[PDB]
Write a structure and sequence with these properties.
homotetramer; about 260 residues; Rossmann fold; binds ligand 0WE; SDR_fam (chains B, C); lipid biosynthesis (chains B, C); EC 1.3.1.9 (chains B, C)
């Protein structure tokens, strides 16, 4: 009797047990969703398969969002298992490292900019468009953003631009798809420690500053982000579209550190 | 089973079966909350008692939020039934009628400004402060707001000012109460009857919103039950739109 | 041939040569404006008179903005000197001291809230309304705000709420006054003595703002002059940050 | 005498006396600045040369912002004439036609997305980066954006995403350059009628709606946008950076049509 009962939700970005996508998956499964997952590259298939099985699913598909054919095949393959799709979680972002270390301009090149946007902003509406023919009439699309879209956070740099584009795509997609009853949202999550953050030099300080300065005085968890994800993907949030929802212990709403 | 199981929640602002507080009350009860209600004066005692009965409740209290003594006596009477409070819903908003019709300037007075801000903004942190001694560490406080806080809406007038104050109090409250663990949020609900100019708004929203429909008290209620629950434990200092996407477009062009 | 040539501008809140109001007067005077000034209290009359002479003006008027009849008298008297008014600077902000120190709830009382809103928010549209019969069609109204309207700042507390309502009154005034052609804006000024928490803010802004300096009353004065002039004739309902970009960052990490 | 006396300012995007760049050039020249101009394509050399002559200038340089070599050579050429640069006006934006007509997903393709963001967003911080070694200690860089960055506007589509990134780049540029005294802002101009807008099928409808609903009940003029631009470029605005200033008759701040 969970609030996502019988719902069919496809999740991208589940790379480890630290992943935001892992949190959303746990929360969706708890609430009775049926889940499917995507992965990048042939060799990653046992790993996503093991995660999927621990959520009662054997539904896993390759998708490198850089590649048009993989985006089309993804949904073509999903359709042989699922007649329609109720939920879509887009939890992917990447810019070449040098575009997010040090100075914004030192790390800016046309190629760095192009890649960060292609992968971190473009992919979301491209997934939506590819999904559209099989979306149910009350489907819900969710993307992951971060406060750096709204305000300049030190080495976030080129990713800030691409997150701002992604949030705008949340508004444009809502208008497009809403005519079909489909909802589109983002969660602007607080920082979360993953393996990929080990190469981010200021990450420890960000975590420290957020713990010390957010209203709840704690970093957020993938359980919290997960549960908010599940709500936005459910019928409980049918009044809600085009929204950027902060799940960040309130951090965005303060001027910390003074 | 339900996501508000055993949660004890106090609702202010219930006036009819079409109130947002009614939608929130319905959704909270379905998810397993125990409910309490306020009313403003013996004139509304009977309506409100009867709504509480519908939700299996007998905890109904007078509270005119112009009155500090009534605010304090509320939680003193509440404390005789409940050791601690998990949730507060603020759904009270008022300005004298002339302050929300016609032109902003022409109908503005200090009195009307005073009352609007007193009833519609001050009263939320005031309930919050009077509640604090009995608030559980992971309590959740929810106010209701409107897009007129953010952008100028014809005839919303002094209410737009008072709702902006309301949304800033959400932020200062979250900072103040947060170390304890208490969360503070609003829903910026779309419109939900029968005034002429209301009609025109309802039509414009239905036409122009991303989802091409007005929101319901069911939808607002569910989003509220969510913010009042532990599912929302990551979320505080948020003004969440529940409007069909309307805030997010430039309609009508 | 300065950009406010011939323009007649009334300024409130001039208290010292360290006032934002003093910066705006000075820039306005450099660009060719004629100035008038309000003050509060017969103890202050000679200082405002002295300030006003420094700017080539002998027009000073009493106006306690808490008092309706002084607001009306203000423009009754100004009218005996100027046929029409081109600019208005609203630079008054007050909350009782406890309401801007320490915890938000601790310093929250109805009286503290009522007063902070009455003086800091209500008084802006109130002046606008009283001035309307004598405003030129291309008049420009300017208020001062601060970032605590937007996001919770540590001691700003009650005043955060009043500034939020102030920024909304800017938008509603823009709609209410714009057909005639009047423009209404705010500057959200960064900090510019006394407080130890203040030195803390000053240092934080200086370290973290994109321009790595605090703003001055010259910088806020030049921006005010611009918004008061025909150069800004396209700009209304705006809250312009003059804060070295501070609002635009997450500092301290 | 003028509030931009002795300032040397380079302006892109001047196509005709209807361009926003033309408004800004004219205000700037009135206030005492010396000007230089970019143009795209040799077919346009003559026109832009007459505009520059009209502004008492003969400094015109070719610059397709799609092309790194041209961006680099622009500043190399500019340097043979000017010691330093005090102003930069970025007034350029483009997405393929289909990406700005009709439904957002309809004209969404990877290449349309790439072109829109490359020309409309990337080109701003790239000009700033190429300009950096000659920027004066109080230089001011100014870009033009539009309300479509903030809320979804009906055919604005891919260009809303590009303007959102551009607005985020204002903030990143402002942190990156700001320690050396350099200011960075956008003007979010209300719609302005050029030969390009026509059409753009909805443009007359937008113009009518902005006129009926804006606080000032009128569309903005290039003179108004030009004067605000002139201000941001001056020492009058030396307290102002990382700002997106609306010059749109207050239109952004209302809910129109109800
Ligand atoms: C927070 C935060 C994050 C996490 N986050 C919210 C993000 O949105 C993305 C982080 C990210 C994006 N792309 C890459 C990497 C990290 C690492 C290695 C790589 O090749 N590409 O990353 C930051 C980078 C700099 C500053 C802050 C942050
Ligand atoms: C929407 C909308 C609403 C609903 N809403 C979101 C509100 O926030 C408050 C509405 C409201 C506040 N105070 C009073 C009344 C209505 C009616 C009678 C009375 O004596 N006082 O009211 C409007 C009034 C004018 C314009 C728009 C709206
Ligand atoms: C900056 C900053 C300021 C300046 N600012 C932008 C303000 O808006 C200050 C407003 C203010 C309001 N009420 C009073 C006082 C100042 C002084 C003395 C008094 O009795 N009442 O004030 C703060 C108060 C707390 C935290 C930061 C700040
Ligand atoms: C206003 C408004 C404008 C003006 N504006 C603010 C813009 O940013 C326009 C941008 C634009 C981008 N790409 C192209 C064109 C214009 C014309 C011709 C072409 O081939 N490509 O354009 C719109 C497009 C759709 C909806 C509204 C608007």
């Amino acid at each position: 009797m969970g609030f996502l009962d019988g719902k069919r939700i496809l999740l991208t970005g589940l790379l480890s047990n630290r992943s935001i996508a892992y949190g959303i998956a746990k929360a969706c499964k708890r609430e009775g969703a049926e889940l499917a997952f995507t992965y990048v590259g042939d060799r990653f298939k046992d790993r996503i398969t093991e995660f999927a099985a621990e959520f009662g699913s054997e539904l896993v598909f390759p998708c490198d969002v850089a590649d048009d054919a993989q985006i089309d095949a993804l949904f073509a393959s999903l359709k042989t298992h699922w007649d329609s799709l109720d939920g879509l979680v887009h939890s992917i972002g990447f810019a070449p490292r040098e575009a997010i270390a040090g100075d914004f301009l030192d790390g800016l090149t046309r190629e760095n900019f192009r890649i960060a946007h292609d992968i971190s902003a473009y992919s979301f509406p491209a997934l939506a468009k590819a999904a559209l023919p099989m979306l149910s009439d009350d489907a819900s699309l969710l993307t992951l953003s971060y406060l750096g879209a709204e305000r300049a956070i030190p080495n976030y740099n080129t990713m800030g631009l691409a997150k701002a584009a992604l949030e705008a795509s949340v508004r444009y997609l809502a208008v497009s798809l809403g005519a079909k009853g489909v909802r589109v949202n983002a969660i602007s999550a607080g920082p979360i420690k993953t393996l990929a953050a080990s190469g981010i030099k200021s990450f420890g300080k960000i975590l420290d500053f957020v713990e010390s300065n957010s209203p709840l005085k704690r970093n957020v968890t993938i359980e919290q982000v997960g549960n908010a994800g599940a709500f936005l993907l459910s019928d409980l949030a049918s009044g809600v579209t085009a929204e950027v929802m902060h799940v960040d212990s309130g951090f965005n709403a303060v001027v910390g550190g003074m």
